[PDB]
Amino acid sequence: GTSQWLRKTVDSAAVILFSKTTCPYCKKVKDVLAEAKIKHATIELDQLSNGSAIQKCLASFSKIETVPQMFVRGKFIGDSQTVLKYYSNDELAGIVNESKYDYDLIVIGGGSGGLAAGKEAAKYGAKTAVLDYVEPTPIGTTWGLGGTCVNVGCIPKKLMHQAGLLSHALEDAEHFGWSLDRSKISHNWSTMVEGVQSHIGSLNWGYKVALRDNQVTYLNAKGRLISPHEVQITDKNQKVSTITGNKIILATGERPKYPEIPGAVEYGITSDDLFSLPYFPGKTLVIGASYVALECAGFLASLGGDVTVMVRSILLRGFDQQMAEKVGDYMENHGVKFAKLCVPDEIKQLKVVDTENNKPGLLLVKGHYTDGKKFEEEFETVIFAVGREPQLSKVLCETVGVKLDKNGRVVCTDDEQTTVSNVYAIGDINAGKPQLTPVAIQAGRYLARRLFAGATELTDYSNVATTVFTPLEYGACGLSEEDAIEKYGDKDIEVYHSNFKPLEWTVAHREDNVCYMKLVCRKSDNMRVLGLHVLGPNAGEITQGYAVAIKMGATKADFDRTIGIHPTCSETFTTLHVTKKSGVSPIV
Amino acid sequence: GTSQWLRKTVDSAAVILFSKTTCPYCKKVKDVLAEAKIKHATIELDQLSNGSAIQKCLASFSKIETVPQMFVRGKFIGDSQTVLKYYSNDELAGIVNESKYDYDLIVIGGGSGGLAAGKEAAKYGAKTAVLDYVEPTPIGTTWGLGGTCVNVGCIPKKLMHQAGLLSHALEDAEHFGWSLDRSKISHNWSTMVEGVQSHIGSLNWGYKVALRDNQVTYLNAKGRLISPHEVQITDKNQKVSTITGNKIILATGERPKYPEIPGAVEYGITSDDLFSLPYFPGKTLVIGASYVALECAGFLASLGGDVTVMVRSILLRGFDQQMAEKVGDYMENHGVKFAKLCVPDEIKQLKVVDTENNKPGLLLVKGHYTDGKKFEEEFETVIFAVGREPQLSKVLCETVGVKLDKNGRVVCTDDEQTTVSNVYAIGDINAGKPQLTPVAIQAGRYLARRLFAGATELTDYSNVATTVFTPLEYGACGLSEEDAIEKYGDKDIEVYHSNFKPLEWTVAHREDNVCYMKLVCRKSDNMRVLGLHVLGPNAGEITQGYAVAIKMGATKADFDRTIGIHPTCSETFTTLHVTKKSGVSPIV
Ligand SMILES: Cc1cc2nc3c(=O)[nH]c(=O)nc-3n(C[C@H](O)[C@H](O)[C@H](O)COP(=O)(O)OP(=O)(O)OC[C@H]3O[C@@H](n4cnc5c(N)ncnc54)[C@H](O)[C@@H]3O)c2cc1C
Ligand SMILES: Cc1cc2nc3c(=O)[nH]c(=O)nc-3n(C[C@H](O)[C@H](O)[C@H](O)COP(=O)(O)OP(=O)(O)OC[C@H]3O[C@@H](n4cnc5c(N)ncnc54)[C@H](O)[C@@H]3O)c2cc1C
Ligand SMILES: [Mg+2]
Ligand SMILES: [Mg+2]
Ligand SMILES: [Mg+2]
């Protein structure tokens, strides 16, 4: 184990120092490298249980067993006296910069995962390039550095969700004694978009500054992997060139799909366009039933819009379907209309978008229900939220040998390695992984540490918590009830559940028994918590801390012995007692 | 210890059935008791690991080793045929109601702990009385059933905190595109109090209905324990009588203290009066620096009031002082004035409260600072928040033998037992325990199960999470940093910390580096999390789930391997990396 780890670490690290924290010769070398502005990884052998074995194995590369030992790109450079010699003779800079490739790491994609990986690799002295290019949407929308979450995902969507939540805060404020009249207050879409876009612009700029400050080369260029170590880049002026890299990280993400029906690309939009749209969508049809579809429909309705969601089959496929039904029922009680069991056939244009008066156009949507009955209605905006897809055919030449699955995602080992030994993939394009921003970030950071700092820690993709930011939010960690029953059998599953009412909803005269939580547990394993589910305000804040406990193997007894914080919504997890098997009502 | 447990269980239970889930004879006995409206505890021997030894040890009472076996107040009643004989002969009701005392349980105090204990005991057939009486405040304020939290504590305070938080929501709404103008909106104190009090009234009524539905006798009477089994009650018409009970639970709580200075009782108020006050306090001085003092000052300022807090020494004594300073600094930047290192000497009346026109009076407060300088300022309302005290000299006759500590609280074992063996104490009067509503509720419920259902589970009072509902909320679980350093030494403590900015604060132009969190960890115990601290919105929702993980022994590695939910405040705990020892800034 140790010899294999050391060989892999030495071969892959850009600049690495084997050290001991007590040794003054090691401190002197560290001080020289810091003065020279040479970044590097450091392995403190006295801080590792197998450090003595590592010292012995180092002689297989350097012929010495002492510390310090400096390596650059697989080559032993020297001990203390030698490194000081190179520094004194002004030779060290050239040595640490010598490389077979232009870069130690090329990251293709400057989104959540790619920026995290590139910044982390640079900390260990890896010469790093991050490529990011945003192909415009069909109507021409484009945006800056940072990827989907920053520009057209989690960040703007949650800010618009907050704008929507504030509608109810205005209503509640009256009951709490404030003098406003909610019925005389209106919402200005353009003012909200300006504020959202100003924040996004600060993030775009902050990422460019962060790459500069980490000595990462940022290329606003489209990359294509043409062989294991060669990336062809096309710049803003269509100039084509090739750069080379030792390790390659594919982090190119996904883009929205469109249905293959007349008028969809021409006259509809997707989430990519929504978050910078200069005019309020107006009367809107959302086609689809993913979390993207429902989150966007929810905030548009809360802002005062006339919104309909066209659902082919079910809501939130892949999520617990009891929770999905409760999410949709709340939305329907709060203004969202649903066209159920329905698909679109064609979008016809009745009015062109009025860019001068800043108004949407008008569309005729024709569709049909599963029984064959026709759907026909006019909408000012049609938003397609019918899934997202990787677009690797343009990122990857087929001759490179990177295996893709049937959906076009990259088939990766548990350490993100593709079928090409120096090429890795992270984020939404890594087949089978949860498609979430903090997952991409952890994967990229942890991978960079394994490549360039000798780390061994893998990303754990199990029991990753989620939150759907619908008008009433839905947080979850672990299995749905139906997946738990499928895996273990109904007789081995116990479900504890309860309704609850936020204290803030009492004086506000809101609903008594809409918020809901459950714990899905395995009886034969000490009532292990297999899944946690909560519908209520601030559901992501509620869920997050429990994800640590679930990671640690929490049981129902662990929830019971923990004392609640009062008054909170979250504390209702600490006193659950009604089982579904008992048939006793969960109402409070 | 099976023999000792069975002896204690049979001796204490009111009505108890020993059964097996796999027995249709037990099913018949359960059905008969259910039809007879006879509530009882049930111990399913097949579900316990030592069930076989219990069956054998039951014969020491019943001379049989089969199930079912029924017991009443220490006496074996019979098997299947025998219980049916009594039922057929109309003898069973008399048998199950025979008792040496009027009640199996008398609970003195109808607050958080006492109501929880009384309701739980009644589930197992314990004939239960709950006594509750609310001695009026000096100005005459009184309230209904439910105790401090329901009437004059957590419930109204959090509702008034929410009214205060809505001030900032109104401001934020403008930046999110809503057309209101916060500067022309005002707050109506009386409207908010009316709504708060209507909710409280629904809780008072709900508790009365809950006791009725559980067959608990509710006496709105002042109780005094005059001997181990005798409680003297004084009813609303001053009629004095004595009732007897087998077990006694003392759950009488505490009341606000006043400083011993002229004018304090006559002209000041406390939290007991604030939550139903019919007029806005106006310009207000809060004397004290507890969480009660700061929570009330905070919401009064957010409602638009002119508020000053007079602090003898420090804020939030007993809490992490770095966090306390950050809490206070936020309040000072958001309208709360602080008179630091200052104590009051006298409250002088300048105008009497005008009850007819619903206006406060006017007071002159004289005090002095530690540097000798004088304090002299006028206020419309003076609120004392200088601690709370038990008042057991009127609850307990000294001859009973219940030992109190130097502060007047009850000295209890880890199972809530006093020095008188049938008398227990729960909630705020139990010396040394966290004085919180969910603690009182757990203690009461768990104690009732041990007394009347043979349970053995104790309440765990360690690492009980808290939240201070100041304008920026402060959640904590475990040790303060200073307590951890005192216990383990600075060299064995590592502190990970970060500022954060809620995404909701970006478009709203709120502060960049005021929200803050830290994990206080023990290096030599695998970086065990000793204390978690968070200052930010929704801090109780953030903190609660982590309390389960801390109960389970979470380490820093457990936080690191858990993935964040994005975008949330809570996810910041999953990526902490800056140590205090490193000196690196925690700013974003
Ligand atoms: C509407 C919406 C809401 C979401 N909400 C949440 C949420 O609340 N929480 C959450 O955790 N996740 C959320 N997500 C998911 C999250 O956005 C993604 O999981 C995350 O952005 C994936 O990161 P990534 O690094 O894999 O890819 P991306 O962030 O998509 O980055 C890939 C980047 O590479 C660029 N690129 C593509 N091809 C090339 C090429 N050939 N050369 C150069 N650059 C290229 C892309 O244009 C893009 O900039 C949401 C997504 C959407 C669409
Ligand atoms: C302003 C304030 C805010 C608080 N906020 C929170 C918070 O956010 N979260 C939290 O967890 N805790 C909070 N607390 C603490 C919480 O209120 C107490 O911990 C809890 O109420 C204690 O319950 P208890 O059963 O011990 O006593 P109590 O709830 O005080 O009940 C005791 C009852 O017994 C009655 N009684 C007294 N003597 C007699 C007698 N001789 N005969 C009959 N009846 C009698 C009393 O009048 C009262 O009704 C707060 C407290 C205050 C004062
Ligand atoms: Mg702005
Ligand atoms: Mg599942
Ligand atoms: Mg009302």
Author numbering:
A (entry chain A), B (entry chain B): 6 to 593
Reproduce the article's own wording on this structure:
Schistosomes survival relies on the redox enzyme thioredoxin glutathione reductase (TGR), a validated target for the development of new anti-schistosomal drugs. The S. mansoni TGR (SmTGR) (EC 1.8.1.9) is a homodimeric flavoprotein with a head-to-tail orientation between monomers. Like all mammalian TR, SmTGR is a selenoprotein carrying the amino acid selenocysteine (Sec597). Paired with Cys596, this residue directly participates in enzymatic catalysis together with FAD and at least two other cystine pairs (Cys28-S–S-Cys31 and Cys154-S–S-Cys159) with redox activity.
A high-resolution dataset was collected at the beamline I04-1 at 100 K and processed with the fully automated pipelines at Diamond Light Source49. The data obtained shows a crystalline form in the P 1 21 1 space group that allowed the generation of a 3D atomic model of the enzyme with 1.25 Å resolution. Due to the high quality and resolution of the data, anisotropic B-factor refinement was performed. Our high-resolution SmTGR crystal structure correlates with its biologically active conformation, a homodimeric protein spanning a total of 1176 residues. The missing residues on N-terminal (1–5) weren't included due to indistinct electron densities typical of terminal regions. The SmTGR Grx domain (1–107) stands out for presenting relatively higher values of anisotropic B-factor, reaching up to 110.63 A2. Considering the high resolution of our apo model, the relatively higher Grx domain B-factor can be an indicative of a high mobility of this domain.
